[PDB]
């Protein structure tokens, strides 16, 4: 309750302030600059009154920040500014209209204005992001992707190899445009192998340094309880035998994979002389039969998820269905722990009653993004970007169904002791506020520390590093974590929209979270979070659709909420909201999303002509030949 609300808020804010103190203290430490400044290091800019950095983050203006970091990161940062802009006027206007009858039409017009302002700011920022994407891609440098494309589902032929097939096909179809062809290799088991070799070499290095320190004994083979099947106290010879065997294993794998007809799938990489050729051919249904020669734009060379490549195309739909069903069952299963958590939300002892449930919830939700990651790993998308897309989608679905609906249902049920659900709904605001403060303020004030990378790096250096220059690749700070970033704020958007016309005080905490997250993530993206891939901000439409769905769901649940005073005779105003919303969405889509999903062919003319004018004498063929060949054995 209110007292517990204040106590939990205080404990969270003090924890966050202590987190800032720790961040500053370790920040000034001189022997860990390698970590908290991964950037300026992968960019090669550095080598070797107590909160001053706070505004220091805000400089380095937006075009400059784009140059420093990258577009998609800028958009992700922009998300928070979007949200704060959306909810500030809504917050103040509602807060003014807190009359604690006329309230019915009051909330009705309040929600109408809320939605109209929301869609207005949405479309405005949508156009702005469209323009900045256009400018960014226009000013973009050359990458091998923009003149090649992925192709899939080529009909098989017993006599002619796939190379001859594709050569004949594209010479007939697009003469004077074809450049080269690359055949996919189905040796992912060798990739698992080379990962194993890396891990074993890492182990052997550890035991080598340890034995150099002093002679020791080891009997725990990665399990302790199920350790070595004996003593094997020395075990260096064990790894020597292992590396010998695996060396002959990889040598063999080479000598058959260089001659395996089975290593080829009905898919390949083809490159064209001009971007326009790529668009015209691979962007459009290429043949008369739409069931073969299936093509879409190629991923970045470092985006190629080679493991997924070995999935037969016929089986992916079956995989999709099986995975969708398994997803529904997993959401079913994880209802019960959440129900436990909410039931925990039932005198100075009640401080833990208000506090713990959010923490516990977060702990049972810590794993789930990883499960969704693997889940998409079994999915077929072949590009870590698209994996991020789908994973975020799944996380949204799970959070919406469980953390919101299941929680409110459980709260109402445990409160009940048919005409009571309406008065039940708003009361869960306290629970949601607590969950927000916890999984937000504290969580961000912690993840600013990068405890896990920091500890990993320090243990690596003190206990595992053998020479120098190996620190440099040792930093793997990880990307922004889109699968975790986008959906959390998406959920907050949903909650704000739903509870705004019923419960105002949810909003200011949301504003606090938005501000702190904006500034902290800005600092991070300035100094850490090297981006593993750089898409053309292609994810934005998904966010737009998600927020639209959020708004319409908020409207519909509000309509349900006004079922308290039965038949207020204003329902047909709540009926117009969804149709207007969906019409707005469809119009926005058909009017602007081509600028994202399609690549402007006129812009292709401009870019290719400018490239030709600035350099008509580039041997681009050899530059593009060896791309998309192989991760390890190029």
Question: Care to describe what's here?
Answer:
The longest helix is centred in the N-terminal third of the chain and has 37 residues. The chain starts with a helix and ends in a 9-residue tail after the last helix. The protein is mainly alpha-helical. A four-stranded antiparallel β-sheet has the order 2-3-1-4. The chain has two domains: 380 residues, no CATH class; 70 residues, no CATH class. This is Hyperosmolality-gated Ca2+ permeable channel 1.2. It holds the Pfam family RSN1_7TM. Belongs to the CSC1 (TC 1.A.17) family. Keywords: Calcium, Ion channel, Ion transport, Membrane, Transmembrane, Transmembrane helix, Transport. Homodimer.
Number of domains: 2
Structural class from helices and strands? mainly alpha
**Radius of gyration, in angstroms, nearest whole number:** 28 Å
Number of helices: 27
User: How much strand?
Assistant: under 5%
Number of distinct beta strands: 4
**CA-CA gap between termini:** 63 Å
Main sheet specs = 4 strands, antiparallel
Fraction of residues in helix: 55-70%
**Judging from the principal axes of the Cα atoms, what is the shape?**
globular
- Spatially, the strands of the biggest sheet line up as 2-3-1-4
């Amino acid at each position: 309750t209110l007292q517990d609300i204040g106590v939990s808020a205080g404990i969270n804010i003090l924890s966050a302030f202590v987190f800032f103190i720790i961040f500053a203290v370790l920040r000034l430490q001189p022997f860990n600059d390698r970590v908290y400044f991964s950037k300026w290091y992968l960019k090669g800019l550095r080598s070797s009154k107590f909160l001053n950095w706070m505004p220091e983050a805000l400089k380095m203006p937006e075009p400059e920040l784009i140059d420093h970091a990258g577009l998609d990161s800028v958009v992700y940062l922009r998300i928070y500014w979007l949200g704060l802009k959306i909810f500030t006027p809504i917050a103040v206007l509602a807060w003014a209209v807190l009359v604690p009858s006329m309230r019915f039409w009051t909330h009705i017009v309040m929600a109408y204005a809320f939605t109209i302002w929301t869609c207005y700011v949405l479309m405005k920022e949508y156009e702005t992001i469209a323009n900045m994407r256009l400018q960014f891609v226009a000013s973009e440098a050359r990458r091998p992707d923009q003149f090649t494309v992925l192709v899939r589902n080529v009909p098989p032929d017993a006599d002619e190899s796939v190379s001859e097939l594709v050569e004949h096909f594209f010479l007939v179809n697009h003469p004077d445009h074809y450049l080269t062809h690359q055949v996919v290799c189905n040796a992912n088991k060798l990739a698992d192998l080379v990962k194993k070799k890396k891990k074993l070499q890492n182990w052997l290095d550890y035991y080598q340094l340890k034995y150099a320190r002093n002679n020791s004994q080891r009997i725990m083979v990665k399990l302790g309880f199920l350790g070595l099947w004996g003593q094997k106290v020395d075990a260096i010879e064990h790894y020597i035998a292992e590396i010998d065997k695996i060396s002959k294993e990889i040598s063999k794998e080479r000598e058959e994979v260089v001659n395996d007809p089975k290593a080829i799938m009905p898919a390949a990489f083809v490159s064209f002389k001009t971007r326009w050729a790529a668009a015209w051919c691979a962007q459009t249904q290429q043949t008369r039969n739409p069931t073969q020669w299936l093509t879409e734009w190629a991923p970045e060379p470092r985006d190629v998820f080679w493991s997924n490549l070995a999935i037969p195309y016929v089986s992916l739909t079956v995989r999709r269905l099986i995975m969708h069903v398994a997803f529904f069952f997993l959401t079913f299963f994880f209802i019960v722990p959440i129900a436990f958590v909410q039931s925990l939300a039932t005198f100075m002892k009640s401080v833990i009653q208000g506090f713990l449930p959010g923490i516990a919830l977060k702990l049972f939700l810590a794993f789930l993004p990883s499960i969704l990651m693997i889940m998409s790993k079994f999915e077929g998308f072949t590009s870590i970007s698209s994996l991020e897309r789908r994973a975020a989608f799944r996380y949204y679905i799970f959070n919406l169904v469980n953390v919101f609906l299941a929680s409110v249902i459980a709260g109402a049920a445990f409160e009940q002791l048919p005409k009571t659900i309406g008065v039940a709904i708003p009361m869960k605001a306290t629970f949601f506020i607590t969950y927000i403060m916890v999984d937000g303020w504290a969580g961000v004030a912690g993840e600013i520390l990068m405890l896990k990378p920091l500890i990993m790096f320090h243990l690596k250096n003190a206990f595992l590093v053998k020479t120098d220059k190996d620190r440099e690749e040792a930093m793997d700070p990880g990307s922004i974590g889109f699968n975790t970033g986008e959906p959390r704020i998406q959920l907050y958007f949903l909650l704000g929209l739903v509870y705004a016309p019923v419960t105002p005080m949810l909003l200011p905490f949301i504003l606090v979270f938005f501000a702190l997250a904006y500034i902290v993530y800005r600092h991070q993206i300035i100094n850490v979070y090297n981006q593993e891939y750089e898409s053309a901000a292609a994810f934005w439409p998904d966010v737009h659709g998600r927020v639209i769905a959020a708004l319409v769901i908020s409207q519909l649940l509000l309509m349900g909420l006004l079922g308290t005073k039965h038949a207020a005779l204003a329902a047909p105003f709540l009926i117009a909201l969804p149709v207007l919303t969906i019409g707005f969405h469809h119009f926005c889509k058909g009017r602007y999303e081509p600028a994202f999903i399609r690549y402007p062919l006129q812009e292709a003319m401009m870019k290719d002509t400018l490239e030709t004018a600035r350099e008509p004498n580039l041997n681009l063929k050899g530059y593009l030949q060896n791309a998309y060949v192989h991760p390890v054995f190029k």
